[PDB]
Amino acid sequence: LTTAEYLAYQTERHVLTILTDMSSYADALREVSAAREEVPGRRGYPGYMYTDLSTIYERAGRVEGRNGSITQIPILTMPNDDITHPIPDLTGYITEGQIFVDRQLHNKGIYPPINVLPSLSRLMKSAIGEGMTRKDHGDVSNQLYAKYAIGKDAAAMKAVVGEEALSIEDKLSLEFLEKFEKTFITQGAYEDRTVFESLDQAWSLLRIYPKEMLNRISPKILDEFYDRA
Amino acid sequence: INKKAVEQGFNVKPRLNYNTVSGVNGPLVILEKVKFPRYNEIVNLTLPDGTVRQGQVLEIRGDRAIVQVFEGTSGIDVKKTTVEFTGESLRIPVSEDMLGRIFDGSGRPIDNGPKVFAEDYLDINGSPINPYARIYPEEMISTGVSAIDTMNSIARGQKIPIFSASGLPHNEIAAQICRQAGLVRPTKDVHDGHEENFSIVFAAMGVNLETARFFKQDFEENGSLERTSLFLNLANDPTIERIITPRLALTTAEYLAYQTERHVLTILTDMSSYADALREVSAAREEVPGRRGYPGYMYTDLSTIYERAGRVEGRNGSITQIPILTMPNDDITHPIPDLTGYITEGQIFVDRQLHNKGIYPPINVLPSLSRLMKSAIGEGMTRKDHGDVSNQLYAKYAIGKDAAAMKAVVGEEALSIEDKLSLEFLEKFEKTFITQGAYEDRTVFESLDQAWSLLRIYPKEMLNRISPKILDEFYDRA
Amino acid sequence: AFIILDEVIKVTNRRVNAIEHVIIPRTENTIAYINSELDELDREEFYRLKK
Amino acid sequence: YGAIYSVSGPVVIAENMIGCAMYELVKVGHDNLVGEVIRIDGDKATIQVYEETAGLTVGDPVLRTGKPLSVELGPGLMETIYDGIQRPLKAIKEESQSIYIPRGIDTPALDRTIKWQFTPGKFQVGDHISGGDIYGSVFENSLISSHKILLPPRSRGTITWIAPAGEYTLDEKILEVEFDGKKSDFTLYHTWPVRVPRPVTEKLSADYPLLTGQRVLDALFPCVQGGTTCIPGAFGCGKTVISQSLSKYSNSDAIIYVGCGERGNEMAEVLMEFPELYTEMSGTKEPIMKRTTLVANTSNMPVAAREASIYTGITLAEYFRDQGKNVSMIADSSSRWAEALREISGRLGEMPADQGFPAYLGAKLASFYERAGKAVALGSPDRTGSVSIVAAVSPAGGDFSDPVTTATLGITQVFWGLDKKLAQRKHFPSINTSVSYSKYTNVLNKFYDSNYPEFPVLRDRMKEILSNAEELEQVVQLVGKSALSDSDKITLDVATLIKEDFLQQNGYSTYDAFCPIWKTFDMMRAFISYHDEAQKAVANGANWSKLADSTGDVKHAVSSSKFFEPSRGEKEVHGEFEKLLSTMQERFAESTD
The structural domains of chain D, with segments of one domain joined by +, span: 1-69, 70-113+187-438, 114-186, 439-593
Q: Which residues of D are annotated as a binding site?
A: 236-241, 428, 505
In a mutational test of the A interface, the residue from C45, C47, C50 whose CB has the highest number of chain A CBs within 10 Å is C45
Q: Is B48 on the interface with D (CB under 8 A)?
A: yes
* Ramachandran sector of residue B27 (left: φ over 0; alpha: ψ -120 to 50; beta: rest): alpha
Burial class (CB in 10 A: 0-12, 13-18, 19+), D11: middle
Residue D79's identity, in one-letter code, is E
Phi and psi at residue D165, to the nearest 5°: -65, 140
| Half-sphere exposure (Cβ direction) of A130: Cα atoms closer than 13 Å | 1
Q: Check C14 against B286: CB less than 8 A apart.
A: no
Pick the residue from chain D with its C-alpha nearest to C44: D351
- Contact between B163 and B179 (Cβ < 8 Å): no
- Residue A14 pairs in a beta bridge with A69
Residues A24, A77 contacting (CB under 8 angstroms): no
8 A C-beta contact, residue B159 and residue B341: no
Looking at chain C from residue 16 to 45, which residues have their Cβ under 8 Å from any Cβ of chain A?
19, 38, 41, 45
Residue D492 Cα to chain centre, angstroms:
36
Of C7, C41, C49, the CB nearest to A39: C49
User: Which of chain C's residues have a Cβ under 8 Å away from the Cβ of D352?
Assistant: 40, 43
CA-CA distance, D429 to D515, in Å (whole number)?
Answer: 13
For testing contact with chain D, the best of B24, B294, B356 (most D CBs within 10 A): B24
Q: Give the rounded distance of the alpha carbon of A79 from its chain centre.
A: 19
Contact at 8 Å (CB) between B322 and B161?
Answer: yes
Which residues in chain B touch residue D362, judged by CB atoms under 8 angstroms apart? 276
Contact C41 A43 (CB under 8 A): yes
Inter-chain touch C19–A160, beta carbons under 8 Å: yes
CB of C40 less than 8 A from some CB of D? yes
CB atoms within 10 A of CB D447: 16
The H or E element spanning position D14 is strand D11-15
Among D410, D468, D362, D436, residue whose Cα is nearest residue B168: D410
> What is the distance between the alpha carbons of residues D296 and B339, in angstroms, rounded to a whole number?
44
User: Nearest residue of D to residue B210 by CA position?
Assistant: D205
CA gap A33, A23 in Å, rounded = 15
Which residues on A lie below 8 Å from C38 (Cβ)? 43
> D120 with D136: CB under 8 angstroms?
yes
C-facing residues of B in 256-295 (CB < 8 A) are: 286, 288-289, 291-293
Question: How far apart (Å, rounded) are the C-alpha atoms in residues D93 and D548?
Answer: 63
CA distance D43 to D16: 5
- Contact between D320 and D382 (Cβ < 8 Å): no
Is residue D215 classed as helix, strand or coil in its secondary structure? helix
Give the up-direction half-sphere exposure of residue A213: CA atoms within 13 A in the CB hemisphere: 15
- How far apart, in whole angstroms, are the C-alpha atoms of residue D520 and residue D525? 9
**With touching defined as 3+ CB pairs under 8 A, do chains B and A touch?**
no
Nearest-Å Rg of the Cα atoms of chain C is: 21
Identity of residue B279: R
Neighbours of chain C (3+ CB pairs under 8 A): A, B, D
* Structural determination approach: cryo-EM
Closest by CA to D329, choosing from D305, D357, D295, is D295
3-state secondary structure of A96: coil
What angle do helix axes D239-248 and D264-273 make, rounded to 10 degrees? 30
DSSP state at residue D253 = S
Q: What are phi and psi of B248, to 5 degrees?
A: -65, -45
Contacts of D197 in chain B (CB under 8 A): 236
> Cis omega before residue B169 (within 30°)?
no
CA dihedral sign of residues D91, D96, D101, D107: negative
How long is chain D?
A: 593
Q: What is the bridge-based pairing of β-strands B199-207 and B228-234?
A: parallel
- The rounded distance, in Å, linking the Cα atoms of D312 and D325 is 17
Q: Among D568, D577, D482, D466, which residue's Cα sits nearest to residue D520?
A: D577
What is the distance between the alpha carbons of residues D50 and D304, in angstroms, rounded to a whole number? Answer: 6
Q: What is the DSSP letter of D431?
A: B
Q: Which residues of chain D have a CB within 8 Å of the CB of B77? A: 19-22
Annotated binding-site members of D for ADP: 236-241, 428, 505
Distance of alpha carbon D388 from alpha carbon D326, whole angstroms: 8
Three-class SS of residue D388?
A: strand
HEC-encoded secondary structure of chain B: CCCHHHCCCCCCCCCEEECCEEEEECCEEEECCCCCCCCCEEEEEECCCCCEEEEEEEEEECCEEEEEECCCCCCCCCCCCEEEEEEEECEEEECHHHCCCEEECCCCECCCCCCCCCCEEEECCCCCCCHHHEECCCCEECCCCHHHHCCCCEECCCECCEEECCCCCHHHHHHHHHHHCCECCCCCCCCCCCCCCCEEEEEEEEECHHHHHHHHHHHHHCCCHHHEEEEEEECCCCCHHHHCHHHHHHHHHHHHHHCCCCEEEEEEECHHHHHHHHHHHHHHHCCCECHHHCECCHHHHHHHHHCCCEEECCCCCEEEEEEEEECCCCCCCCHHHHHHHHHCCCEEEECHHHHHCCCCCCECCCCCECCCHHHHCCCCCCCCCHHHHHHHHHHHHHHHHHHHHHHHHHCCCCCCHHHHHHHHHHHHHHHHHCCCCCCCCCCHHHHHHHHHHHHCCCCHHHCCCCCHHHHHHHCCCC
Over the Cα atoms of chain A, what is R_g?
21
